[PDB]
Amino acid sequence: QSVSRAAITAAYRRPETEAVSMLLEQARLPQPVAEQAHKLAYQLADKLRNQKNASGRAGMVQGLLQEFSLSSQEGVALMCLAEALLRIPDKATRDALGEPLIRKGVDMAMRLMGEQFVTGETIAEALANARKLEEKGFRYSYDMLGEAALTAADAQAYMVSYQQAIHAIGKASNGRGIYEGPGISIKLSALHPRYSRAQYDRVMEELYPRLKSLTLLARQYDIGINIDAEESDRLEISLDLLEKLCFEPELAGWNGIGFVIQAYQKRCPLVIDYLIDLATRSRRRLMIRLVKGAYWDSEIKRAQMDGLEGYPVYTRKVYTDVSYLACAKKLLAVPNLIYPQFATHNAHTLAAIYQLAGQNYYPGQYEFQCLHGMGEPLYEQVTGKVADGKLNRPCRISAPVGTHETLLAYLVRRLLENGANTSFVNRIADTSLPLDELVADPVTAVEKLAQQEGQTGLPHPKIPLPRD
Amino acid sequence: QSVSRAAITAAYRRPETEAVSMLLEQARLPQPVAEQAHKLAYQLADKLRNQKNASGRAGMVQGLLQEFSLSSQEGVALMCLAEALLRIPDKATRDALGEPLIRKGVDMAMRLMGEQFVTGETIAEALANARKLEEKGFRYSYDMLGEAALTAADAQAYMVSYQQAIHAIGKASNGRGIYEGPGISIKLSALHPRYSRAQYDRVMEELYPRLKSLTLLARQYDIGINIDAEESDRLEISLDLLEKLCFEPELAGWNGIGFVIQAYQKRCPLVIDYLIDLATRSRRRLMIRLVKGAYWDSEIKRAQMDGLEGYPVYTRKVYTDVSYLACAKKLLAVPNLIYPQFATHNAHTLAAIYQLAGQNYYPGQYEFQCLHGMGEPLYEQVTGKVADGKLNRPCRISAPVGTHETLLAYLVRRLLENGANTSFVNRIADTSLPLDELVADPVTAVEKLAQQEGQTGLPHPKIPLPRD
Ligand SMILES: Cc1cc2nc3c(=O)[nH]c(=O)nc-3n(C[C@H](O)[C@H](O)[C@H](O)COP(=O)(O)OP(=O)(O)OCC3O[C@@H](n4cnc5c(N)ncnc54)[C@H](O)[C@@H]3O)c2cc1C
Ligand SMILES: Cc1cc2nc3c(=O)[nH]c(=O)nc-3n(C[C@H](O)[C@H](O)[C@H](O)COP(=O)(O)OP(=O)(O)OCC3O[C@@H](n4cnc5c(N)ncnc54)[C@H](O)[C@@H]3O)c2cc1C
Ligand SMILES: O=C(O)[C@@H]1C[C@@H](O)CN1
Ligand SMILES: O=C(O)[C@@H]1C[C@@H](O)CN1
């Protein structure tokens, strides 16, 4: 392997104490920057939590819950009485006074919960809904739902769906280009049957020509085409595919190839070193989506079953946060080689990147990204005019496109993401968690754990090594 | 009295059968127009009811509620099971498996429920919030809360608050003018102590100079100034004040004087005849807000206590709807004399006015109006570009300004309006009421009642004449 590819391989499952300790100083925000990040994060989070005065109203209730020492079901009774009294029109009057059921249930629960996350049933419908936010400075990436093709027929249908989508998105883009215009994202697992266990030779013979074909088509329309990151044991083959793609003569001088990297992997910073070298060698600017990672629960389960030396992902959420910040700095350092796209719904992460990107933002420096149904509220504070009290930073919304028949896997990942006690979007909804705790700096949090536990980067107490 | 003033007086409490029968043909929409009104009303109402697919989702539930014959608490249990199952990360695993308390309570209930209806605590705060919707084509009228001044000191404080508000609104308007720019609305009951029983001479000596002063100030800034309509026994004195105001030399050639008329009053069409004559004589275009009326519950109570010959308002809601349509046609007929401002949250009423206004709309022909916290959803379909799927008709939002100390009366009127089974905004939320019933034409509804009951315009069966 090349020097950079070899380094990736060696970092695959390196001990967490080692991995985290190495990231810490790369992730640490300079005192000035950290303060500004905190203030901005606090502000974003406060505005989000207090949208319709939710907190102000809460304070009003408790202010009476004590003046009468009433229970929850008590204060409510009083409000009910007060409401009835306020409905008296005249003040004087007021004053004076089998398995199919289970299978169907899961299917329906999936669809009801999934609606919030899906932009459209078809690409035409999705694209029709774009103007509203695009006119506000938002951008879109269309995510054709459906993954892990099991059969040759399945993969072919996905291929056809991508091609049609590119034509549609490309026509809608109308030459807006890879930055301001919409793009598409693809899953390699959709393009090859049984990708999960597919061998190198067959992937190169069969998947690659499909990847190349879609990419050439995207280039014809000048839209971004992003390669999604999936399970960790497919990282290596995805890099091999990316490597080959970047050297296609027909793509020379075109910077629309995108690639996701997952900060929850120990390999992430090493993947970045490789990508930097690849952009240099292939003479392009890569569009890189930095995400934390959507498959954590499965990654942990998988590793515990394979009984290997360790995990390919961190076991404490705060370590993934630290990894993201360290990786963000690396990406921001090389604007000639990478267009960083910072996917996050986390107010601290957003504010940290905003400060790390430095003075003198220009549109092509970077963008934020979010998932439809999750990020719009946060980014409505971010994308738009400074005069309107926004940050004037672009956000690209990932917009799922598909019917109920393709929704399951995506929906499950969203449930895990939204339901996890560790998730920012879960904690922001816990009004008992103080804002300062919510937007706490991850590097400092890691150092606090280190002082308490006796060393930096210990694994989660409840997630022992697979061999234990 | 003049011919027009005399006609108003004679119509004060005319029998409902007579009043309604007289309105019917003036209100009747030409077959073509009625159909277009129905289609548009249905569309507006459907989009409002189905915002986040509320109905589509409802249909999905019942589709299973029968396939298993499950109770409400039953289907819910299944969804709960399905949700837990969908939280299993790996599919294989899933598959295999005293009076102060009362006074305080009323105060707090008032404030919690009132927030949705109040734009700002102060005029500066209110004005700061205007750009968002103004940029979308909305307009504002600021409603300084506080009415029915009891003391001289009270009225003076209201007067000062209005003056300060005009300066603020006028500065914010910045010469946008009476149509495109914000205006203010005032209550005569705020400007004179014990207005409810005030005599003509004292009102002319004391209230009028205040009204004149505010109006001259509004003219200096070229903003609209609207006289609110209050209880029915103050209609006459309000007309006397308006009459005098319209002939002030300093207001000559200025068309910013506004006046509300209430369609629920039997006098409404006669007031319009008077206003038409007044605009002609005083050589101005009057800004007229046609509203249905906010004091119905109190009007009925008042009449039943005074034991008079009849009611000054209709006793069936559908009659008020008919009155509004008849009155709207009268206003639209005289664009040189009146700028009609159609206040309503009712999709049928809106659609009917839209069609009645005819072909070749121009911005200065008319506007719609709504209350903050009630009308924005409906009018988001209306104000804005045709290309964006809107109707391109302006709506002016009435924006209450004030603290909790001035909120009570306004809030109570909003509770009655929102809570009434007869209110459009209440019925649209009743998903068991078919859309077609919701947007049913009021003239046809009245004719249906007439055929069933044996004559047109009978009073509400539950609201006998006061002397009964
Ligand atoms: C536009 C877009 C494209 C995306 N593409 C991909 C993609 O191709 N592949 C993909 O994998 N994800 C992808 N993601 C999504 C992504 O990974 C999740 O949305 C993300 O991890 C949420 O991070 P956050 O900063 O919003 O929330 P945060 O609440 O701050 O962090 C959330 C998360 O931390 C991690 N985590 C949770 N618990 C632990 C733990 N105990 N130990 C270590 N880490 C933990 C997870 O990665 C997790 O999702 C994409 C997201 C967006 C917005
Ligand atoms: C910008 C603005 C300014 C306003 N200014 C004033 C004002 O100065 N004075 C004022 O009085 N109102 C004023 N109103 C408000 C107003 O009168 C109510 O908002 C209104 O009546 C609601 O009508 P609607 O078409 O939205 O609802 P709809 O549901 O179609 O009709 C509602 C109503 O019909 C009436 N009604 C209810 N029951 C009966 C019945 N049994 N018999 C007869 N009629 C019945 C009422 O007038 C009532 O509010 C204003 C409203 C707005 C938007
Ligand atoms: O599948 C997922 O969970 C993420 C989100 C999308 O952008 C696609 N990759
Ligand atoms: O007081 C009311 O109820 C109405 C609404 C405002 O426009 C003022 N008049």
Q: How many helices (H) and strands (E) does chain A have?
A: 23, 8
Residue with tokens 């109203």: A57
**3-state DSSP assignment of residue B422:** coil
For residue A426, give both structure tokens: 């879960």
- Phi, psi (rounded to 5 degrees) for A303: -65, -35
Q: B441 near B38, Cβ under 8 Å?
A: yes
> Chain A contact for B95, CB < 8 A?
no
Length of chain A, in residues: 468
Q: Is B349 in the pocket of ligand 2 (CB under 6 A)?
A: yes
Among candidates A64, A113, A131 on the partner chain, residue whose Cβ is nearest the Cβ of B108: A64
| Dist CA B443 CA A330 (whole Å) | 71
| Dist CA A405 CA A411 (whole Å) | 11
Look up residue B410 and give its amino acid.
Answer: Y
Q: What is the resolution of this structure in A?
A: 1.8
Ligand 2 pocket mutation, candidates B291, B379, B423, criterion most atoms within 8 A of CB: B291
Hey, which residues does B184 pair with through a beta bridge? B142, B225
| Dist CA A70 CA A298 (whole Å) | 46
Contact at CB, B79 and A108, closer than 8 angstroms: yes
Alpha helices in A399-467 (DSSP H): 408-419, 424-427, 435-438, 442-453
User: Among candidates A230, A292, A268, which has minimal Cα distance to A417?
Assistant: A292
Return the exposure string of B204-217: e unless at least 16 CB atoms fall within 10 Å of the residue's CB, then b.
eeebbebbbebbbb
> Chain A contact for B465, CB < 8 A?
no
Residue A19, C-beta contacts closer than 8 angstroms, at least 6 positions apart? A11, A266, A314, A319, A457
- Phi, psi (rounded to 5 degrees) for B256: -95, 0
| Dist CA A112 CA B62 (whole Å) | 13
| Dist CA A355 CA A347 (whole Å) | 12
Task: Write the DSSP symbol of residue B1.
Answer: -
| Dist CA A25 CA A11 (whole Å) | 18
Residue A371, C-beta contacts closer than 8 angstroms, at least 6 positions apart? A117, A343, A345, A397, A398, A414
Ligand 3 pocket mutation, candidates A144, A230, A410, A423, criterion most atoms within 8 A of CB: A410
Question: Which residue minimizes the CA distance to atom 25 of ligand 1?
Answer: A344
Among candidates B61, B78, B115 on the partner chain, residue whose Cβ is nearest the Cβ of A53: B115
CA angle B235, B236, B240 (to 5 degrees): 115
Q: Which residues line ligand 4 (CB under 6 A)?
A: B 143, 185, 228, 294, 371, 398, 410, 413
> Chain A contact for B433, CB < 8 A?
no
Contact at CB, A86 and B111, closer than 8 angstroms: no
Look up residue A88 and give its amino acid.
Answer: I
Distances (CA, A) of B328 to B262, B324, B325, B346, B352: 11, 6, 5, 14, 9
Contact at CB, B87 and A301, closer than 8 angstroms: no
For residue B230, give both structure tokens: 């209050």
Residue B190, C-beta contacts closer than 8 angstroms, at least 6 positions apart? B144, B146, B147, B148, B149, B155, B158, B159, B162
| Dist CA A261 CA A228 (whole Å) | 8
Task: Write the DSSP symbol of residue B395.
Answer: E
User: Among candidates B372, B404, B369, which has minimal Cα distance to B111?
Assistant: B404
Residue with tokens 């009104």: B37
Q: Is A417 in the pocket of ligand 3 (CB under 6 A)?
A: no
Among candidates B79, B104, B105 on the partner chain, residue whose Cβ is nearest the Cβ of A105: B79
Question: Which residue minimizes the CA distance to atom 40 of ligand 2?
Answer: B317
> Chain A contact for B131, CB < 8 A?
yes
> Chain A contact for B82, CB < 8 A?
yes
Residue with tokens 């420096």: A365
User: Among candidates B153, B146, B165, B147, which has minimal Cα distance to B406?
Assistant: B146
> Chain B contact for A77, CB < 8 A?
no
Q: State how far residue B334 is from chain A, nearest Cα, in angstroms.
A: 37
Q: Is A228 in the pocket of ligand 3 (CB under 6 A)?
A: yes
User: Among candidates B216, B239, B107, B111, which has minimal Cα distance to B170?
Assistant: B216
Q: Is A264 in the pocket of ligand 1 (CB under 6 A)?
A: yes
Bridge-based pairing of strands B395-401 and A367-371 is unpaired
| Dist CA A409 CA A423 (whole Å) | 19
Rounded to a whole number of angstroms, the CA Rg of chain B reads 24
Contact at CB, B113 and A83, closer than 8 angstroms: yes
Residue with tokens 């099991």: A150
**Is residue B414 classed exposed, middle or buried when 0-12, 13-18 and 19+ CB atoms within 10 A define those classes?**
buried
For B288, the enclosing helix (H) or strand (E) is: strand B286-291
**3-state DSSP assignment of residue A407:** coil
Contact at CB, A82 and B106, closer than 8 angstroms: yes
For the packed helices A268-282 and A317-332, what is the interaxial angle rounded to 10 degrees? 20
For residue A174, give both structure tokens: 């109308």
Rounded to a whole number of angstroms, the CA Rg of chain A reads 24
Q: A381 near A136, Cβ under 8 Å?
A: no
Among candidates B86, B105, B419 on the partner chain, residue whose Cβ is nearest the Cβ of A82: B105
Q: Is B232 in the pocket of ligand 2 (CB under 6 A)?
A: no
**Is residue A66 classed exposed, middle or buried when 0-12, 13-18 and 19+ CB atoms within 10 A define those classes?**
exposed
- Phi, psi (rounded to 5 degrees) for A264: -75, -10
For A257, the enclosing helix (H) or strand (E) is: strand A257-262
| Dist CA A98 CA A106 (whole Å) | 13
- State the DSSP string of A58-92: HHHHHHHHTTTT--HHHHHHHHHHHHHHHTSS-HH
For B150, the enclosing helix (H) or strand (E) is: none
| Dist CA B293 CA A126 (whole Å) | 43
- For chains A and B, CB pairs below 8 A equal 118
Q: Is A408 in the pocket of ligand 3 (CB under 6 A)?
A: no
Cα(B55) to ligand 1 centroid in Å equals: 33
Contact at CB, B78 and A64, closer than 8 angstroms: no
| Dist CA B9 CA B233 (whole Å) | 11
For the packed helices B317-332 and B347-356, what is the interaxial angle rounded to 10 degrees? 20
| Dist CA A274 CA A5 (whole Å) | 6
Q: B111 near A63, Cβ under 8 Å?
A: no
Contact at CB, A110 and B78, closer than 8 angstroms: no
Breaks (C-N over 2.5 A) in chain B follow: 97
| Dist CA A35 CA B288 (whole Å) | 55
| Dist CA A365 CA A342 (whole Å) | 11
| Dist CA A321 CA A348 (whole Å) | 10
**Is residue B390 classed exposed, middle or buried when 0-12, 13-18 and 19+ CB atoms within 10 A define those classes?**
middle
| Dist CA B21 CA B13 (whole Å) | 15
Bridge-based pairing of strands A286-291 and B395-401 is unpaired
Tell me the longest C-alpha to C-alpha distance in chain A.
Answer: 89
Distances (CA, A) of B104 to A68, A79, B202: 10, 10, 37
Ligand 1 pocket mutation, candidates A189, A320, A321, criterion most atoms within 8 A of CB: A320
- Give B-chain residues touching A90 at CB under 8 angstroms: 297-298, 301
User: Among candidates B208, B217, B165, which has minimal Cα distance to B188?
Assistant: B208
**Is residue B34 classed exposed, middle or buried when 0-12, 13-18 and 19+ CB atoms within 10 A define those classes?**
middle
For residue A145, give both structure tokens: 């739902």
Name the residue of chain B whose CA is nearest to A90's CA. B298
> Chain B contact for A416, CB < 8 A?
yes
Residue B232, C-beta contacts closer than 8 angstroms, at least 6 positions apart? B262, B265, B295, B299, B302, B312, B313
Task: Write the DSSP symbol of residue A413.
Answer: H
Q: B118 near B372, Cβ under 8 Å?
A: yes
- Give B-chain residues touching A415 at CB under 8 angstroms: 83, 86-87
Contact at CB, A109 and B86, closer than 8 angstroms: yes
Ligand 1 pocket mutation, candidates A317, A376, A401, A410, criterion most atoms within 8 A of CB: A317
Bridge-based pairing of strands B338-343 and B367-371 is parallel
Among candidates A81, A93, A388 on the partner chain, residue whose Cβ is nearest the Cβ of B105: A81
For residue A407, give both structure tokens: 């929704």
Q: Dihedral of CA B276/B281/B287/B289: which sign?
A: negative
Cα(B396) to ligand 2 centroid in Å equals: 16
- State the DSSP string of A336-397: TTEEEEEE---HHHHHHHHHHT-SS--GGG-EEEEETTTSHHHHTTTSS-GGGT-----EEE
> Chain B contact for A306, CB < 8 A?
no
Q: B140 near B99, Cβ under 8 Å?
A: no
| Dist CA A13 CA A6 (whole Å) | 13
Breaks (C-N over 2.5 A) in chain A follow: 97
> Chain B contact for A102, CB < 8 A?
yes
B81: left (phi over 0), alpha (psi -120 to 50) or beta: alpha
> Chain A contact for B25, CB < 8 A?
no
- Give A-chain residues touching B109 at CB under 8 angstroms: 79, 82-83, 85-86
Residue with tokens 């936010």: A133
Q: A369 near A397, Cβ under 8 Å?
A: yes
User: Among candidates A319, A309, A311, which has minimal Cα distance to A467?
Assistant: A309
Atom of ligand 4 nearest to the CA of B417: 3
Atom of ligand 1 nearest to the CA of A417: 49
Measured from the alpha carbon of residue B426, the closest ligand is: 2
Atom of ligand 4 nearest to the CA of B260: 9
B240-243, Cβ contacts within 8 angstroms, sequence gap of 24 or more: B240/B200, B240/B203, B240/B204, B241/B188, B241/B203, B241/B204, B241/B207, B241/B208, B241/B211, B242/B278, B243/B278
User: Among candidates A346, A228, A198, A351, which has minimal Cα distance to A294?
Assistant: A228
For residue A49, give both structure tokens: 């939590």
Task: Write the DSSP symbol of residue B249.
Answer: G
For residue A165, give both structure tokens: 């989508």
Residue with tokens 């006609």: B7
